[PDB]
Amino acid sequence: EVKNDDLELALKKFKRVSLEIRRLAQRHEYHLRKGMRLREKRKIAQKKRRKFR
Amino acid sequence: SLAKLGEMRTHVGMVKRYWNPKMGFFIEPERKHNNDHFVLELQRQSLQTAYNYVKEVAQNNGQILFVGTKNDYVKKLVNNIAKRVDVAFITQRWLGGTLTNFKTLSISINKLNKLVEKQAENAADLTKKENLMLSREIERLEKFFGGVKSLKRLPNLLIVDDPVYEKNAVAEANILRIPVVALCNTNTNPELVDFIIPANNHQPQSTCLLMNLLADAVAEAKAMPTMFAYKPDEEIQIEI
Amino acid sequence: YCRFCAIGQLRIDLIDDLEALKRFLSPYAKINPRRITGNCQMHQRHVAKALKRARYLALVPFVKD
Amino acid sequence: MQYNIILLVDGSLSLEQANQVNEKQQQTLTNVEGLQTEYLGLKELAYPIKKQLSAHYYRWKFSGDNQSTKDFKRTANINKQVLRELIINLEREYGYLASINPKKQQLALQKRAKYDEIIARENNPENPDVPVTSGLASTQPRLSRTEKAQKPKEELWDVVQKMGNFD
Amino acid sequence: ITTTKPIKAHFDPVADLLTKINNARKAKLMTVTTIASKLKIAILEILVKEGYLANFQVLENKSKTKRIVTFNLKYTQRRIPSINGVKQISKPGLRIYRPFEKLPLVLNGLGIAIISTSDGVMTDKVARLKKIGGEILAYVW
Amino acid sequence: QIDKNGIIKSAQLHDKDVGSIQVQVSLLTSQIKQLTDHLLANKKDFISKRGLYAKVSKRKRLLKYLKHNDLEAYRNLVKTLNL
RNA sequence: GGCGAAGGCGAAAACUUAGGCCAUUACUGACGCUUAGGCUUGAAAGUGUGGGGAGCAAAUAGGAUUAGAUACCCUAGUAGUCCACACCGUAAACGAUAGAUACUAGCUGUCGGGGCGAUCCCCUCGGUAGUGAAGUUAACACAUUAAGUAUCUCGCCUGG
Question: How far is Cα C20 from Cα F50, in angstroms, rounded to an integer?
Answer: 44
Which residues in chain D have their CB less than 8 angstroms from residue C62's CB? 47
CA of F57 to C1' of G113 (A): 30
Chain centroid to CA B174: 16
Per-residue b or e along B124-149, where b marks 16 or more CB atoms closer than 10 Å to that residue's CB:
eeeeeeebeeeeeebeebbebbbbbe
CA of B158 to C1' of G142 (A): 39
Contact criterion met (CB below 8 Å) for D49 and D84: yes
Suggest the residue from B27, B42, B52, B56 to mutate for an interface test with chain D (most D CBs closer than 10 A).
Answer: B56
Nearest CA-CA partner of C35 in D87, B125, F17, A48: A48
Contact criterion met (CB below 8 Å) for E55 and E30: no
Return all residues near B36 (Cβ < 8 A) that are at least 6 apart: B14, B19, B27, B30, B185, B186
Contact criterion met (CB below 8 Å) for D76 and D85: yes
Taking every pair of C-alpha atoms in chain C, what is the biggest distance, in angstroms? 29
Point out the nucleotide closest to D134 (alpha carbon to C1′). Answer: G116
CA of B21 to C1' of G104 (A): 14
Q: Do chains B and A touch (3 or more CB pairs under 8 A)?
A: no
Instruction: Let me know the angle formed at the C-alpha of B223 by B221 and B226, rounded to the nearest 5 degrees.
Output: 85
SS3 state of residue F66: helix
Q: Is the CB of D48 under 7 A from strand G?
A: no
DSSP state of E100: G
Nearest CA-CA partner of E31 in E71, E58, E3: E71
Residues 11-50 of F with CB under 7 A from strand G: 14-21, 31, 34-35, 37-38, 41-44, 46-50
Q: Is the CB of E17 under 7 A from strand G?
A: yes
Point out the nucleotide closest to F43 (alpha carbon to C1′). Answer: G16
Question: How far is Cα A46 from Cα E65, in angstroms, rounded to an integer?
Answer: 50
Point out the nucleotide closest to D138 (alpha carbon to C1′). Answer: G124
| Shortest CA gap E61–chain D (Å) | 4
Contact criterion met (CB below 8 Å) for E121 and E114: yes
Gap positions in chain E, given as the residue before each gap (C–N > 2.5 A)? none
The H-or-E segment that residue A17 falls in is helix A10-25
Q: Do chains E and A touch (3 or more CB pairs under 8 A)?
A: no
Return all residues near B120 (Cβ < 8 A) that are at least 6 apart: none
The residue segments making up the domain with residue C37 are 1-65
Residues 6-45 of A with CB under 7 A from strand G: 31, 34
Contact criterion met (CB below 8 Å) for B43 and B229: no
- Domain map of chain F by residue range? 1-83
Please count the structural domains in chain C. Answer: 1
SS3 state of residue E19: helix
Suggest the residue from D132, D157, D159 to mutate for an interface test with chain B (most B CBs closer than 10 A).
Answer: D159
Alpha carbon separation from D18 to B175, D15, D37, D88, F10 (Å, rounded): 91, 5, 11, 20, 49
The H-or-E segment that residue F35 falls in is helix F21-41
Nearest CA-CA partner of D19 in D60, D52, D77: D60
Contact criterion met (CB below 8 Å) for F57 and F34: no
Q: What is the DSSP string of chain B?
A: --S-TTS-------SSS---TTHHHHS----SSS-----HHHHHHHHHHHHHHHHHHHTT---EEE---SSSHHHHHHHHHHHH-SS-B-SS---SSSSS-SHHHHHHHHHHHHHHHHHHH-SSSS-HHHHHHHHHHHHHHHHH-TTGGG-SSPPSEEE-S-TTT-HHHHHHHHSS-------B-SSS-GGG-SS--B---SSHHHHHHHHHHHHHHHHTTTT---SSSS-S--------
Q: Are strands D2-7 and E97-98 parallel, antiparallel or unpaired?
A: unpaired
Question: How far is Cα B185 from Cα B199, in angstroms, rounded to an integer?
Answer: 6
Alpha carbon separation from C49 to C21, C44, D84 (Å, rounded): 12, 9, 17
Contact criterion met (CB below 8 Å) for D130 and B33: no
Q: What is the DSSP string of chain D?
A: -EEEEEE--STT--HHHHHHHHHHHHTT-SS------EEEEEEE-SS-SSS-SEEEEEEEEEE-SSSTTHHHHHHHHH-SS-S--EEEES---S---TTTHHHHHHHHHHHHHHS--SSS----TT----------TT------EEEEEES-----PPSS--S----
Nearest CA-CA partner of B199 in B228, B32, B188, B215: B188
Contact criterion met (CB below 8 Å) for E24 and E73: yes
Point out the nucleotide closest to E92 (alpha carbon to C1′). Answer: G151
Which residues in chain E have their CB less than 8 angstroms from residue D136's CB? none
Architecture of domain D4-88: 2-Layer Sandwich (3.30)
Alpha carbon separation from B79 to A10, B34, B85, E31 (Å, rounded): 65, 31, 10, 46
PDB resolution in Å: 12.1
Point out the nucleotide closest to F64 (alpha carbon to C1′). Answer: G31
CA of E114 to C1' of G101 (A): 28
SS3 state of residue F4: coil
Question: How far is Cα B169 from Cα B161, in angstroms, rounded to an integer?
Answer: 10
Point out the nucleotide closest to F70 (alpha carbon to C1′). Answer: G29
Q: Is the CB of D93 under 7 A from strand G?
A: no
Four-CA torsion C55, C59, C62, C63, nearest 10 degrees:
-160
Question: How far is Cα E10 from Cα E24, in angstroms, rounded to an integer?
Answer: 19
DSSP state of C30: B
Question: How far is Cα E105 from Cα E61, in angstroms, rounded to an integer?
Answer: 39
The H-or-E segment that residue F17 falls in is none
Q: At what angle do helices E13-27 and E38-50 cross, to 10 degrees?
A: 40
Q: Do D160 and B193 touch (CB under 8 A)?
A: yes
| Shortest CA gap B75–chain D (Å) | 27
Question: How far is Cα B162 from Cα B169, in angstroms, rounded to an integer?
Answer: 10
Technique that determined the structure: cryo-EM
Per-residue b or e along B45-61, where b marks 16 or more CB atoms closer than 10 Å to that residue's CB:
ebbbbbbebbbbbbeee
Question: How far is Cα B23 from Cα B190, in angstroms, rounded to an integer?
Answer: 7
DSSP state of E134: E
CA of D70 to C1' of G81 (A): 29
Residue type, E83: I
Residues 63-82 of F with CB under 7 A from strand G: 65, 68-70
Q: Are strands E56-60 and E67-72 parallel, antiparallel or unpaired?
A: antiparallel
Whether the CA torsion D61, D65, D69, D75 is positive or negative: it is: negative
Q: Is the CB of E19 under 7 A from strand G?
A: yes
Suggest the residue from A4, A5, A15, A20 to mutate for an interface test with chain C (most C CBs closer than 10 A).
Answer: A20
Chain centroid to CA E4: 25
Looking at the complex, does the CB of residue D161 fall below 8 Å from at least one CB of chain B?
Answer: yes
Question: How far is Cα B23 from Cα B153, in angstroms, rounded to an integer?
Answer: 34
Chain centroid to CA B190: 17
Nearest CA-CA partner of D163 in B151, B89, B156, B215: B156
Q: Is the CB of C45 under 7 A from strand G?
A: yes
Looking at the complex, does the CB of residue D164 fall below 8 Å from at least one CB of chain B?
Answer: yes
Question: How far is Cα C43 from Cα B156, in angstroms, rounded to an integer?
Answer: 64
Question: How far is Cα F10 from Cα F78, in angstroms, rounded to an integer?
Answer: 13
CB proximity under 8 Å: D 119-158 to E = 139-155, 157-158
SS3 state of residue F79: coil
Question: How far is Cα E113 from Cα A8, in angstroms, rounded to an integer?
Answer: 94
Q: Is the CB of B22 under 7 A from strand G?
A: yes
Q: Is the CB of C28 under 7 A from strand G?
A: no
Which residues in chain D have their CB less than 8 angstroms from residue B163's CB? none
Q: Is the CB of D72 under 7 A from strand G?
A: no
Q: Least CA distance to D97: which residue of chain C?
A: C10
Residue type, B88: A
Question: How far is Cα B166 from Cα B68, in angstroms, rounded to an integer?
Answer: 8
Q: Do E60 and D157 touch (CB under 8 A)?
A: no
Looking at the complex, does the CB of residue E63 fall below 8 Å from at least one CB of chain D?
Answer: no
Question: How far is Cα B11 from Cα C19, in angstroms, rounded to an integer?
Answer: 51
Contact criterion met (CB below 8 Å) for B233 and B6: yes
Question: How far is Cα B74 from Cα B66, in angstroms, rounded to an integer?
Answer: 10
Nearest CA-CA partner of B210 in B27, B77, B67: B77
Interface of D with C (CB under 8 A): 43-49, 83-84, 86, 88, 92-95, 100, 107, 110-111, 114, 125-126
The shortest CB-CB distance from D157 to any of E57, E58, E77 is to: E77
Q: How many CB atoms are located within 10 Å of the residue E131 CB?
A: 10
Nucleotides of chain G in contact with protein CB (under 7 A) are: 1-2, 4-5, 7, 9-19, 22-33, 38-42, 56-57, 85-86, 100-125, 133-135, 144, 148-153
SS3 state of residue E94: strand
Q: Do E54 and D157 touch (CB under 8 A)?
A: no
Q: Is the CB of D110 under 7 A from strand G?
A: yes
